[PDB]
Amino acid sequence: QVINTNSLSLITQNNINKNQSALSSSIERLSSGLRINSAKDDAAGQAI
Amino acid sequence: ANRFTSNIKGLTQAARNANDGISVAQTTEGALSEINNNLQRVRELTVQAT
Amino acid sequence: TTDPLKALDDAIASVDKFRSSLGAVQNRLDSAVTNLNNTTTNL
Amino acid sequence: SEAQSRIQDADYATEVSNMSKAQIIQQAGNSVLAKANQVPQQVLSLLQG
Numbered sequence: 001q002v003i004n005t006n007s008l009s010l011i012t013q014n015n016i017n018k019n020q021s022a023l024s025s026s027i028e029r030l031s032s033g034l035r036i037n038s039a040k041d042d043a044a045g046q047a048i
Numbered sequence: 049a050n051r052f053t054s055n056i057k058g059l060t061q062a063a064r065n066a067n068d069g070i071s072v073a074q075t076t077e078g079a080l081s082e083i084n085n086n087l088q089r090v091r092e093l094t095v096q097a098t
Numbered sequence: 099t100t101d102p103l104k105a106l107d108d109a110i111a112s113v114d115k116f117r118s119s120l121g122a123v124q125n126r127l128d129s130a131v132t133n134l135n136n137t138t139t140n141l
Numbered sequence: 142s143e144a145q146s147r148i149q150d151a152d153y154a155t156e157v158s159n160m161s162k163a164q165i166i167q168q169a170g171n172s173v174l175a176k177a178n179q180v181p182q183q184v185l186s187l188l189q190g
Contacts, residue, residue: 030173031173033169071141075136075137075140082132082133
């Protein structure tokens with residue numbers, strides 16, 4: 001019945017934070033127009 | 049529980065520190081991209097000059 | 099005035115030098131602006 | 142004259158393609174900007190309940 005920890009909320013926040021990166025990547029790709037917009041993406045594709 | 053609290057605080061601070069490395073990497077990557085563009089234009093100029 | 103066309107040619111080259119330097123400075127400043135924008139966003 | 146034409150003039154097909162590409166990029170990016178600006182709203186829902 002514990003209210004000093006609401007672990008369900010922690011799981012939900014973890015999932016939202018996980019989705020955040022994908023959402024940001026999708027927006028960045030849509031705005032820029034290039035799938036390799038940084039070295040973190042491929043960087044072998046970036047070098048070539 | 050005291051040890052658990054210490055570990056939780058340390059790990060949260062560690063993630064906060066980790067974000068800084070990503071920030072530094074992004075800044076340096078942007079600067080390097082600008083250097084890349086300058087080098088590409090220099091190469092084009094040399095191809096024109098030779 | 100002796101050798102007039104040579105005088106005109108060197109004058110034209112001398113103004114072209116200044117124009118080219120000015121354009122190079124323009125490109126310099128534009129690249130600086132873009133890098134500053136990226137750095138500001140990251141900060 | 143032919144050499145100067147090959148040096149200073151622009152190729153209209155390429156320029157039209159570049160203009161179209163830039164216009165589409167601008168419109169798409171601005172729509173995504175509108176979506177990103179609409180993003181922060183759910184905190185209000187969290188606060189209200």
